[PDB]
Design a protein around this ligand. Structure first.
Ligand SMILES: [Cl-]
Ligand SMILES: [Mg+2]
Ligand SMILES: [Mg+2]
Lengths: 250, 240, 235, 231, 243, 111, 244, 195, 241
């Protein structure tokens, strides 16, 4: 046995292209649409819960994931690749930051760590690149609210608002017309639902849409009282009912 | 670990990777070595395709391995740094364990052995570098000049050149260099080294580097003006 | 591509057979064994007149009682010589005696097939190992990159090998003197060499019980060349 | 064809070509004969030279006082396998104060050769071996193929033109098996057997190599003027 | 195409062609069988006599594992020996930790997982043997057959090699005509017959019969070779049936 | 605490003649004030006309002799059945002993 | 086995070139142009962001200009992810040196170290090289202000003015024309922006498509200050030089 | 080894080291130089357990000489002293620490200032105008505390050193066989052949 | 075209080796079904013993992973047993490390992560199996979680796997469209097994004897398989109404 693939599987072609990264980006293009919008007092990330079967319980499959109490993530592309990246992202936030500094990492540095993991899968021996693009929304004390995109290459960019996957080109155009620097969080959620409706074919409701926010601190979700400085997680996943309420005022 | 055999024999008994490493040397800038009666001179070409260069900080072509030995090269620049570093480490290791500085022949044998090792080790390619190693042994006044190449073979030379258009300057040296009476002085040795490079270089401005090594760790690099005076005198005699 | 340790349909290792082709391109080396000693001689073959020919080292001492000549990719021989010298001296450490020539040759040949995917390829050099011990007397061995070694009364390796071997076939007899062997190596080297044989482009050496392994001076060889010319002109 | 690049690849008919190519190296090798009675076991080997100035390559190797073999094919591979047998014979003596059974020696060689036929990177052994020995169950003769197959036999031969000697032994089976307490007559039968594989060349003093082991006979090799008696 | 050049590669069918090529090596080998009886198992194998120079009864093919398990195989003999060596290591470590001798179903999975592991990577070749094995444990008699893919099942009777079809047909008759079961001594006789009947597929060269058995009553649940009079009695019964 | 060494007593004597040599030793083996054996051989024929006795801690003495006999066997294999001379054996034995410089064979050896 | 799928990233071509290094350089030639200009009283680093969007958050964005320590900075051309791996290694090397010798790392030593890492990927390991070319801008008390470049081959050279990435041929000609030795920082700032404005593939050069930085002794008395320009500050210098 | 002293004056650093080597009740040598030139303007004296001293000094020497060749530049005395300290602070938590105390005397050609560093085997570094290791400072510090000025000449520093040595020779029970004295200044390193 | 031999991306952004592993899943030609009751989770699978020489008791594609978790496999038996052995080891390790029984969904996720690695790392091939895990979880109640060679997994109200999965899936879909609940409203597991068999009969259009089926049942604190005689009693009750 032994892993005898100690050589790169991603290499430069004569034209300067890294084939496997381009092909990974193609897999991301086939994936279901997901988006992110940044407001003045929050960030929203959203995607469609594309259920593979009506017998399948789509609540058990979480496309939007908590990484830290103040950082959330959504993706487009290959689901299994995303799931393992979330596991690694959650762990690296502890091992390379929280266990050292006693606090959770700022969004940009956690993004930097995830990016590193994805870059290594693009150069290390005997592996293919991850077939996903991530959208990571978060908040921290000194940088405020932020939204980042991470691609299969490991490259990451900060966005005011963006979309990835199936109907990203149309969705990004829609967001350019609606976005401004004075948006409140509720306005951003409203725009997110409008943008997402264009890429969805079938049912459009709280059970087929997954949406989460980075906003105000939630002391009700903390699970304990007695420490003034601990005020609760800024990440919150919107319920099926909460989504439907905002679809009536749509 | 990556163990792949990159340097292997072909049906006609050739190791192509080693031979292709020689082609990288052929592409490299010209380097020349000439030993006089009491000195050795190392000449090096600088390609003038690169101007706006900062000549203060740009890596010089001739490298001191120790206070009494120097090394110049032709071929891949990045590869040469690895050989030079190893040679410098070995030079200090020899002083540390044997309480004498390396002989020029010993240092050459080490560098040549490293090059050879990279022609039959798994997962590595040969160095795309040929070197000229020159200097004087401790407490000796006999000039030393050696050459190495990617295959790992080495030998001593009265005068030698490597790199691009080395065939032409070697032709010049073969008819101009006399063994019975080598360049008696430093002037004669430098003049012959500059003359040989002028067959290939193009302009005699900032394209020629000269480094003189004398006995007892006396090593100095000539400046642009000093070399330019040689270039002037050579062509003025040529107009006849 | 294909494995480095692959057999051909004829039952030969491709890489070993290809290394043998590299050895055919090498400069000529000749060995002759007699009851008065073993003589080793080589073609230096300098690529240019500016190359100082005395730095060309194709004949090498392994121990006081064992010498060695090489042909092919000579850079590959350095680690083999190093191993041979270490093996010879280590045996002297462990057993307070000289090591048998055959045992030394066997130790060198054990390295040969240590290649795969250990070193990445076979050696591209053949060795003539000459020496003397108390048990089997004066001996000459031919060590190949296949790991095989044959003992020889006389042997030639390199570019002019088959032409030289045919000449050694006729000339060798069991009553040869050392002086006769010296001239015979010079004669055959002069025959197969491209350039004209002299003391600067050819080198002689021998191994005797009394004096051990000795590389001949250029002045000493020059006299043997002059002695050769006169005896050929004598008839 | 497309399935002979390495040892780790079966062909569509279930063949291992690298092993078959290794088997081919044995057929190119010089002939060697093995045969036994109830008291003794004999090896006879035709040595091969490079030319008239060269020596004749040794074919027989001693493994222990009671065991040894003859080779045909790549000699270095025989040196590796014989070194392994020497160690195993020696492990049996040092640990268990027990002379290694010839049958168990065959089983060990089989398993060592097999590992080289199933793994990537390595290669099969390119040599065939005839092992003889005398242990607690009497005289023994084994034939080793680098495919891994080991076979206990009354007599056999391997190498170039070995079919002639093998046919002779197949006829003589009833005669030479009965040669008990007579080493010289058993060797005669072996020398006569290997003679059926000769063409052009004949058995000379530095050409022939013989080895014997038996009841009160340690494994000994005969070369030079010691085999002139049997020419 | 090119899917059959490397082990562990799925073809567009979902097949591992290298494993299927290993089966061809098995089908090329000599015939071996297994028969499950009332309180044990019987194993038998065809040994081709390539030459008169082969010493009779010396080149033993059937192998014991621990003291209660017998193993026989068809195909590449060295591959079978390698598998039995592993089986012996697996049986030893089981007994070392758990004290009791390894149960047959437990042992079957140890081989199965090992053989299956040689279908997971291109750096290894699949096994070129089908192995028939079994014995007696606390829960009674068990007979198994294991293929190059790592696939194995329990069997009432089992057969592999060049004469497997002929053998299988004969085994199917015994299952039908004996629903209440077959005795150990009967199974030895029947095993001899089946090997002789299966020899029609290898009829060029003559052969040597080799039988072994584990039985609770006849061998105290230990693996033993059938020797001497009991072997000759089975050969006589077999020779009588073909004529 | 476990003491890996012991003392089995015994005494040996080697005398060199002009064309012969003798190696003598008593046959008694002991621990403390008890007798283990009245006849336990201590001097051995190691082959190549060499005799050897490693006196002191019997377990280390048996191991050393066993290893030297092994060294003689492999000297024949590796060097064409050459006879191991007494001076060569002596040098070989030094290296057997010094290989355990930091956990010695507790024996006094004579060949 | 696995050999079948190995691309062999560290081999020579018959012409004596390294395939992967040459192809990596081809990749880099499509990256946004980065320019470095060295003056007597400071160094300028200018670089062009690649086809941006209006929805990109520029003030928190960084793809071209990175800080290695207080004295040394780099401009990137190629794969950003690959560059960040190397940048973090270089930051660590600078801190190791400072811990060992209690002095800030000389610029060349840092450059040589990174270039040696790049070289290693071309000679052993069987991995693809880093598709990155750096421009190093730095200061130390030995050589003063220094500009270097390194590429995937691991070869590095010193410069008075230099460009990497797209349109370097055109850019280098323009720099070679207008550059003079007695030049100052304010003049070098103007030269860098003018060169980008002429070589750019975009229709017009704007603040949102640029990253800019200076290393000046224009810090209060004998010391060096790094200035990574903000979006508004890039907008002002574009108006000052008369481009927008 | 026994006594090593150091004093930094106006324009130079002076190092004085004992000449004796002792194994038990016997003086093996009376002319031992307990110093290594690390670079042309940096000298290191040393004292500690046998073997460790010379092995460490020569190891440091080789590293600094390697740096000099690689960069074609001489490290500042401060940079050298920091390199040495790290090697000793690394050594103290190793399986077998180097039992060596050192003084580093150098002339910084950039600042045109002499500099003296005292470093013990633990990796404890301190820059001083004058310093000593072992029992040396116990006898000499009172004289140095009294007589030392930072504007002293090299000749005045040598006279104060003679006084320190005279006190050692009177009150120390051990005979250290005098001292070898070396001066480090702008022009390099030289030995005072008469002391 | 080596992008089809190992798990690297094709130009279309596809992994062909993963897709071909899905095809190996149906090599056995067996259909499985899983449904949830109030207090239980039932899994049934077709049993086919083609050879008379086989011991039918040893022919099984249902595995008892732990006391609480059961697993049915769709795919070749060597890969099935490979997955089974690993799941048993993981479940045991989990209990030792974390002090409570591994939940069905957590084990499913773990095995799905292992499968994902085989789709990313070149030297490891995907297992050509679909794994359906069942239990009565102490927190989530009756549970069905299914894993595939892509590394995908999800929870189910009910599920079906095999060549004729679509026919079974639609049959189940139609039943739950009527009842408007996420489970079989039934007290005893015996009647839930009867429901499972009945709806497989209706979907496949074939009658079953006692030896044609294989049944696994998960209750609180234990998972167990039914014997042939237990299945016969189940078949009799179906026929009598
Ligand atoms: Cl996991
Ligand atoms: Mg101190
Ligand atoms: Mg894979």
């Amino acid at each position: 046995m032994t892993d005898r693939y100690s050589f790169s599987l991603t290499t430069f072609s004569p034209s300067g292209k890294l084939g496997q990264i381009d092909y990974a980006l193609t897999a991301v293009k086939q994936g279901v649409t997901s988006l992110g919008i940044k407001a003045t007092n929050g960030v929203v990330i959203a995607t469609e819960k594309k259920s593979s079967s009506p017998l399948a319980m789509s609540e058990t499959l979480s496309k939007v994931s908590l990484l830290t109490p103040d950082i959330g993530a959504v993706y487009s592309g290959m689901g299994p690749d995303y799931r393992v990246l979330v596991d690694k992202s959650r762990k690296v936030a502890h091992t390379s930051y929280k266990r050292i500094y006693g606090e959770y990492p700022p969004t940009k540095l956690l993004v930097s760590e995830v990016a590193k993991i994805m870059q290594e899968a693009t150069q290390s021996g005997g592996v293919r690149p991850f077939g996903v693009s991530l959208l990571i929304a978060g908040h921290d004390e000194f940088n405020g609210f932020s939204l980042y995109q991470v691609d299969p290459s490991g490259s990451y960019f900060p966005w005011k608002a963006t979309a990835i996957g199936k109907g990203s080109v149309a969705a990004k155009t829609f967001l350019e017309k609606r976005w401004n620097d004075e948006l409140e969080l509720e306005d951003a959620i409203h725009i997110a639902l409008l943008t997402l409706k264009e890429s969805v074919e079938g049912e459009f409701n709280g059970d087929t849409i997954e949406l989460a926010i980075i906003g105000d601190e939630n002391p009700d979700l903390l699970g304990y009282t007695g420490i003034p400085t601990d005020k609760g997680p800024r990440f919150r996943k919107l319920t099926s009912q909460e989504i439907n309420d905002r679809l009536e005022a749509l | 670990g990556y163990d792949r055999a990159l340097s292997i024999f072909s049906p006609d008994g050739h190791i192509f990777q080693v031979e292709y490493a020689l082609e990288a040397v052929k592409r490299g800038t010209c380097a020349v070595g000439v030993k006089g009666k009491n000195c050795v001179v190392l000449g090096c070409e600088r390609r003038s395709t690169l101007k706006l260069q900062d000549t203060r900080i740009t890596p010089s072509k001739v490298s001191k391995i120790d206070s009494h030995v120097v090394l110049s090269f032709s071929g891949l620049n990045a590869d040469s740094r690895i050989l030079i570093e190893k040679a410098r480490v070995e030079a200090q290791s020899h002083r540390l364990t044997l309480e004498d500085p390396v002989t020029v022949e010993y240092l050459t044998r080490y560098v040549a052995g490293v090059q050879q090792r990279y022609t039959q080790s798994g997962g590595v390619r040969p160095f795309g570098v040929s070197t000229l190693i020159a200097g004087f042994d401790p407490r000796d006044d006999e000039p030393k000049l050696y050459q190495t190449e990617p295959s790992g073979i080495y030998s001593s030379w009265s005068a030698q050149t490597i790199g691009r258009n080395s065939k032409t300057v070697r032709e010049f040296l073969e008819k101009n260099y006399d063994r019975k009476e080598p360049p008696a002085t430093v002037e004669e040795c430098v003049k012959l080294t500059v003359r040989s490079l002028l067959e290939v270089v193009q302009t005699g401005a900032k394209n020629i580097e000269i480094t003189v090594v004398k006995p007892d760790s006396d090593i100095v690099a000539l400046s642009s003006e000093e070399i330019n005076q040689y270039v002037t005198q050579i062509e003025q005699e040529k107009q006849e | 591509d294909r494995g480095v340790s692959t057999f051909s349909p004829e039952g030969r290792l491709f890489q070993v057979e290809y290394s043998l082709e590299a050895i055919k391109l090498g400069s000529t080396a000749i060995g002759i064994a007699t009851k008065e000693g073993v003589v080793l001689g080589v073609e230096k073959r300098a690529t240019s007149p500016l190359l100082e020919s005395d730095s060309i080292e194709k004949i090498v001492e392994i121990d006081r009682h064992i010498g060695c000549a090489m042909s092919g990719l000579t850079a590959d021989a350095r680690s083999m010589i190093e191993h041979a010298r270490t093996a010879a001296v280590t045996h002297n450490l462990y057993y307070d005696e000289d090591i048998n020539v055959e045992s030394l040759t066997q130790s060198v040949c054990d390295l040969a097939l240590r290649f795969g995917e250990l070193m990445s390829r076979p050696f591209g050099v053949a060795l003539l190992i000459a020496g003397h011990d108390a048990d089997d007397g004066y001996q000459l061995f031919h060590a190949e990159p296949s790991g095989t070694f044959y003992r020889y009364n006389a042997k030639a390796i390199g570019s002019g090998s088959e032409g030289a071997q045919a000449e050694l076939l006729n000339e060798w007899h069991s009553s040869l003197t050392l002086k006769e062997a010296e001239l015979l190596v010079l004669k055959i080297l002069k025959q197969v060499m491209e350039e004209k044989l002299d003391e600067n482009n050819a080198q002689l050496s021998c191994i005797t019980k009394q004096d051990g392994f000795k590389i001949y001076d250029n002045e000493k060889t020059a006299e043997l060349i002059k002695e050769l010319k006169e005896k050929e002109a004598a008839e | 064809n497309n399935y002979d690049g390495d040892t780790v690849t079966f062909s569509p008919t279930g063949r291992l070509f690298q092993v078959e190519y290794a088997l081919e190296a044995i057929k190119q090798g010089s002939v060697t004969v093995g045969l036994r009675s109830n008291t003794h076991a004999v090896l006879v080997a035709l040595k091969r030279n490079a030319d008239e100035l060269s020596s004749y390559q040794k074919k027989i190797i001693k493994c222990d006082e009671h065991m040894g073999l003859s080779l045909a094919g790549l000699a270095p591979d025989a040196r590796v396998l014989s070194n392994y047998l020497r160690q195993q014979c020696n492990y049996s003596s040092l640990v268990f104060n027990r002379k290694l059974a010839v049958e168990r020696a065959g089983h060990l060689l089989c398993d060592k050769a097999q590992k080289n036929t199933q793994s990537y990177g390595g290669r099969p052994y390119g040599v065939g071996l005839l092992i003889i020995g005398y242990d607690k169950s009497g005289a023994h003769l084994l034939e080793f193929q680098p495919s891994g197959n080991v076979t206990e036999l009354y007599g056999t031969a391997i190498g170039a033109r070995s079919q002639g000697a093998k046919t002779y032994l197949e006829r003589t089976l009833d005669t030479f098996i009965k040669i008990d307490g007579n080493p010289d007559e058993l060797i005669k039968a072996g020398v006569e057997a290997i003679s059926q594989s000769l063409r052009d060349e004949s058995l000379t003093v530095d050409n022939l190599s013989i080895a014997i082991v038996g009841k009160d006979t340690p494994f000994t090799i005969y070369d030079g003027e010691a085999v002139a008696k049997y020419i | 195409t090119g899917y059959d050049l490397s082990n562990s590669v799925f073809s567009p069918d979902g097949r591992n062609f290298q494993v299927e090529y290993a089966v061809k090596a098995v089908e090329n080998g000599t015939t071996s069988i297994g028969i499950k009886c009332n309180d044990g198992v019987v194993f038998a194998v065809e040994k081709l006599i390539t030459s008169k120079l082969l010493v009779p009864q010396k080149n033993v093919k059937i192998q014991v594992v621990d003291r209660h398990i017998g193993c026989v195989y068809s195909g590449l003999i060295p591959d079978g020996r390698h598998l039995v060596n592993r089986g012996r290591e697996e049986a030893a470590s089981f007994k070392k930790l758990y004290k009791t001798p390894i149960p047959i179903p437990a042992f079957a999975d140890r081989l199965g997982q090992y053989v299956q592991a040689h279908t997971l990577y291109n750096s290894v070749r699949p096994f070129g043997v089908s192995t028939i094995f079994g014995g007696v444990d606390k829960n009674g008699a068990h007979l198994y057959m294991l293929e190059p893919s790592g696939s194995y099942w329990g069997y009432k009777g089992a057969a592999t090699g060049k004469g497997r079809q002929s053998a299988k047909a004969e085994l199917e008759k015994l299952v039908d005509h004996h629903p209440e079961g077959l005795s150990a001594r009967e199974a030895v006789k029947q095993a001899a017959k089946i090997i002789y009947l299966a020899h029609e597929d290898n009829k060029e060269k003559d052969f040597e019969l080799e039988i072994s058995w584990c039985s609770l009553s006849e061998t105290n649940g230990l693996h033993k070779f059938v020797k001497g009079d009991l072997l000759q009695e089975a050969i006589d019964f077999a020779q009588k049936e073909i004529n | 605490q476990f003491n890996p060494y012991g003392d089995n007593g015994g005494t040996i004597l080697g005398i060199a003649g002009e064309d012969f040599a003798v190696l003598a030793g008593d046959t008694r083996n002991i621990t403390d004030y008890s007798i283990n054996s009245r006849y336990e051989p201590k001097v051995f024929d190691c082959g190549d006309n060499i005799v050897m006795s490693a006196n002191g801690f019997a377990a280390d003495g048996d191991a050393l002799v066993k290893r030297f006999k092994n060294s003689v066997k492999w000297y024949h294999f590796d060097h064409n059945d050459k006879k191991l001379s007494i001076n060569s054996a002596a040098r070989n034995i030094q290296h057997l002993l010094y290989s355990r410089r930091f956990f010695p064979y507790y024996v006094y050896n004579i060949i | 086995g696995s050999r079948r799928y190995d691309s062999r990233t560290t081999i020579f071509s018959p012409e004596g070139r390294l395939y992967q290094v040459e192809y990596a350089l081809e990749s880099i030639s499509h990256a946004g142009t980065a320019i470095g200009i060295m003056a007597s009283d400071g160094i300028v680093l200018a670089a062009e962001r690649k086809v941006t969007s209006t929805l990109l958050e520029q003030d928190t964005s960084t793809e071209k200009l990175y800080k290695l320590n207080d004295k040394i900075a780099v401009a990137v051309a190629g794969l950003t992810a690959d560059a960040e791996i190397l940048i973090n290694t270089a930051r660590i090397h600078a801190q190791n040196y400072l811990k060992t010798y209690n002095e800030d790392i000389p610029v060349e030593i840092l450059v040589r170290r990174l270039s040696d890492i790049k070289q290693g990927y071309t000679q052993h390991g069987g991995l693809r090289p880093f598709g990155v070319s750096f421009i190093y801008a730095g200061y130390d008390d030995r050589y003063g202000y220094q500009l270097y470049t390194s590429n995937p081959s691991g070869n590095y050279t010193g410069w008075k003015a230099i460009s990497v990435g797209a349109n370097t041929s055109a850019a280098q000609t323009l720099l070679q024309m207008d550059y003079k030795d007695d030049m100052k920082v304010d003049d070098a700032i103007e030269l860098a922006l003018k060169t980008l404005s002429k070589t750019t593939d975009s229709s017009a050069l704007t603040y949102d498509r640029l990253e800019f930085a200076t290393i000046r002794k224009g810090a209060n008395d004998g010391e060096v200050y790094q200035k990574i320009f903000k979006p508004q500050e890039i907008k002002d210098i574009l108006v000052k030089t008369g481009i927008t | 080894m026994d006594i090593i002293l150091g004093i930094r004056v106006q324009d130079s650093v002076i190092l004085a080291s004992s000449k004796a080597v002792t194994r038990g009740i016997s003086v093996l040598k009376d002319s031992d130089d307990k110093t290594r030139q690390l670079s042309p303007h940096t000298l290191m004296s040393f004292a500690g357990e046998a073997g460790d001293t010379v092995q460490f000094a020569e190891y440091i020497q080789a590293n600094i000489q390697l740096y000099s060749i690689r960069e074609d530049y001489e490290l500042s005395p401060q940079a050298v002293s920091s390199f040495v300290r790290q090697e000793l602070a690394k050594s103290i938590r190793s399986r077998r620490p180097y039992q060596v105390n050192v003084l580093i005397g150098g002339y910084d050609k950039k600042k045109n200032k002499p500099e003296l560093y005292q470093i013990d085997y633990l990796g404890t570094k301190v820059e001083l105008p004058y310093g000593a290791h072992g029992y040396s400072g116990f006898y000499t510090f009172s004289l140095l505390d009294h007589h030392y000025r930072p504007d002293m000449t090299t000749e005045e520093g040598l006279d104060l050193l003679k006084l320190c040595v005279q006190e050692l020779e009177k009150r120390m029970p051990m005979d250290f066989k005098g001292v070898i004295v070396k001066i480090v200044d702008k022009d390099g390193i030289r030995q005072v052949d008469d002391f | 075209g080596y992008d089809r031999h190992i798990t690297i991306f094709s130009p279309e952004g596809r992994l062909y080796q993963v897709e071909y592993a899905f095809k190996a899943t149906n090599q056995t030609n067996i259909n499985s079904l899983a449904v949830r009751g109030k207090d239980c989770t039932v899994v049934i699978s077709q049993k086919k013993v083609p050879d008379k020489l086989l011991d039918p008791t040893t022919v099984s594609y249902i595995f008892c992973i732990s006391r609480t978790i059961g697993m049915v496999v769709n795919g070749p038996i060597p890969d099935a047993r490979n997955a089974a052995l690993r799941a048993k080891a993981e479940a045991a390790e989990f209990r030792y490390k974390y002090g409570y029984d591994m939940p069905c969904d957590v084990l499913a996720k773990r095995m799905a992560n292992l499968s994902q690695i085989y789709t990313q790392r070149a030297y490891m091939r995907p297992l050509g199996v679909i794994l359906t895990f069942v239990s009565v979880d102490e927190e989530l109640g009756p549970s069905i979680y299914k894993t595939d060679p892509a590394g995908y997994y999800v929870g189910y109200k009910a599920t079906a796997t095999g060549p004729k999965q679509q026919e079974i899936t639609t049959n189940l879909e139609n039943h739950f469209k009527k009842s408007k609940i996420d489970h079989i409203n039934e007290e005893s597991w015996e009647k839930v097994v009867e429901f499972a068999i009945t709806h497989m009969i209706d979907a496949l259009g074939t009658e079953f004897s006692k030896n044609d089926l294989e049944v696994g049942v998960a209750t609180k604190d234990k998972f167990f398989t039914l014997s042939a005689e237990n299945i016969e009693e189940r078949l009799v009750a179906i026929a009598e109404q």
